[PDB]
Design a protein around this motif. Structure first.
Motif, PDB file in Angstrom:
ATOM      1  N   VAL A   2      -5.790   4.354  -1.762  1.00 37.24           N
ATOM      2  CA  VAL A   2      -5.241   5.100  -0.624  1.00 37.24           C
ATOM      3  C   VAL A   2      -4.019   4.750  -0.184  1.00 37.24           C
ATOM      4  O   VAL A   2      -3.615   3.773  -0.132  1.00 37.24           O
ATOM      5  CB  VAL A   2      -6.383   5.208   0.536  1.00 37.24           C
ATOM      6  CG1 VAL A   2      -5.764   5.973   1.598  1.00 37.24           C
ATOM      7  CG2 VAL A   2      -7.850   5.471   0.045  1.00 37.24           C
ATOM      8  N   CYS A   3      -3.135   5.938   0.115  1.00 36.46           N
ATOM      9  CA  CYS A   3      -1.721   5.784   0.682  1.00 36.46           C
ATOM     10  C   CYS A   3      -0.905   4.865  -0.001  1.00 36.46           C
ATOM     11  O   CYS A   3      -0.760   3.562   0.287  1.00 36.46           O
ATOM     12  CB  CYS A   3      -1.977   5.176   1.992  1.00 36.46           C
ATOM     13  SG  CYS A   3      -0.473   5.747   3.138  1.00 36.46           S
ATOM     14  N   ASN A   4      -0.909   5.176  -1.270  1.00 33.93           N
ATOM     15  CA  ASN A   4      -0.338   4.365  -2.268  1.00 33.93           C
ATOM     16  C   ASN A   4       0.747   4.639  -3.296  1.00 33.93           C
ATOM     17  O   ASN A   4       1.251   4.100  -4.116  1.00 33.93           O
ATOM     18  CB  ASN A   4      -1.688   4.279  -3.354  1.00 33.93           C
ATOM     19  CG  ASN A   4      -1.172   3.526  -4.907  1.00 33.93           C
ATOM     20  OD1 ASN A   4      -0.763   2.457  -4.717  1.00 33.93           O
ATOM     21  ND2 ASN A   4      -1.559   4.248  -5.865  1.00 33.93           N
ATOM     22  N   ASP A   8      -4.447   9.943  -6.663  1.00 34.84           N
ATOM     23  CA  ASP A   8      -5.342   9.649  -7.091  1.00 34.84           C
ATOM     24  C   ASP A   8      -6.810  10.411  -6.802  1.00 34.84           C
ATOM     25  O   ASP A   8      -7.366  10.321  -7.546  1.00 34.84           O
ATOM     26  CB  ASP A   8      -5.679   8.087  -6.531  1.00 34.84           C
ATOM     27  CG  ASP A   8      -4.674   7.114  -6.774  1.00 34.84           C
ATOM     28  OD1 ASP A   8      -4.431   7.067  -7.964  1.00 34.84           O
ATOM     29  OD2 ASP A   8      -4.146   6.524  -5.848  1.00 34.84           O
ATOM     30  N   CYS A   9      -6.474  11.051  -5.726  1.00 33.26           N
ATOM     31  CA  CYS A   9      -7.443  12.467  -5.615  1.00 33.26           C
ATOM     32  C   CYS A   9      -6.461  13.444  -6.580  1.00 33.26           C
ATOM     33  O   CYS A   9      -5.285  13.537  -6.806  1.00 33.26           O
ATOM     34  CB  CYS A   9      -7.637  13.194  -4.240  1.00 33.26           C
ATOM     35  SG  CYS A   9      -8.296  11.946  -3.245  1.00 33.26           S
ATOM     36  N   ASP A  15      -5.483  11.190  -0.079  1.00 33.02           N
ATOM     37  CA  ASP A  15      -5.069   9.667  -0.085  1.00 33.02           C
ATOM     38  C   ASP A  15      -3.759   9.602   0.107  1.00 33.02           C
ATOM     39  O   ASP A  15      -3.287   8.659   0.619  1.00 33.02           O
ATOM     40  CB  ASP A  15      -5.461   9.114  -1.498  1.00 33.02           C
ATOM     41  CG  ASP A  15      -5.060   9.618  -2.824  1.00 33.02           C
ATOM     42  OD1 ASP A  15      -5.293  11.119  -2.835  1.00 33.02           O
ATOM     43  OD2 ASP A  15      -4.635   9.213  -3.701  1.00 33.02           O
ATOM     44  N   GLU A  16      -2.891  10.573  -0.126  1.00 30.12           N
ATOM     45  CA  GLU A  16      -1.452  10.767   0.139  1.00 30.12           C
ATOM     46  C   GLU A  16      -1.059  11.386   1.416  1.00 30.12           C
ATOM     47  O   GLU A  16       0.003  11.789   1.662  1.00 30.12           O
ATOM     48  CB  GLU A  16      -0.706  10.966  -1.045  1.00 30.12           C
ATOM     49  CG  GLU A  16      -0.661  10.104  -2.064  1.00 30.12           C
ATOM     50  CD  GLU A  16      -0.220   8.655  -1.651  1.00 30.12           C
ATOM     51  OE1 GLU A  16       0.847   8.696  -1.107  1.00 30.12           O
ATOM     52  OE2 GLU A  16      -0.711   7.581  -2.136  1.00 30.12           O
ATOM     53  N   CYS A  19       0.999   9.851   5.512  1.00 29.79           N
ATOM     54  CA  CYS A  19       1.439   8.475   4.945  1.00 29.79           C
ATOM     55  C   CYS A  19       2.777   8.159   4.992  1.00 29.79           C
ATOM     56  O   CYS A  19       3.707   8.969   4.449  1.00 29.79           O
ATOM     57  CB  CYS A  19       0.968   8.177   3.331  1.00 29.79           C
ATOM     58  SG  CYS A  19      -0.688   7.677   3.249  1.00 29.79           S
TER      59      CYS A  19
END
Lengths: 49, 50
Positions: A2-4, A8-9, A15-16, A19
């Motif tokens: 997550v927040c990476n 990644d989804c 996840d982004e 952010c």
């Protein structure tokens, strides 16, 4: 993941969401996948081929 | 949202949400057929009486 800095989804990118780019770090030097790697992920029908 | 990396050649594309795939599956098929026919017929007849 997550927040990476990577989605990644896959279809969603939740996840982004929301952010801060100051909190992100560069996940990798590059984003470009191999020229047609998506074809490696297709299904296949053995009869019709 | 989206913003997954999608490429064709060096260009990168934003896939619409509605689209599951748009992918450069590249193929080509060619067909050439040529049929030439000739016929000719010749009939000469001569009759002479003296």
């Amino acid at each position: 993941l997550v927040c990476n800095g990577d989605s990644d989804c896959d279809e969603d990118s939740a996840d982004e969401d929301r952010c801060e780019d100051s909190e992100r770090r560069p996940s990798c030097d590059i984003d470009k996948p191999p020229p047609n790697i998506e074809l490696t992920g297709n299904g296949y029908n053995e009869l019709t081929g | 949202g989206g913003c997954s990396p999608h490429y064709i050649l060096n260009t990168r594309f934003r896939k619409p949400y509605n689209v599951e795939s748009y992918t450069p599956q590249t193929q080509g098929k060619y067909e050439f057929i040529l049929k030439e026919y000739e016929s000719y017929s010749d009939f000469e007849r001569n009759v002479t009486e003296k």
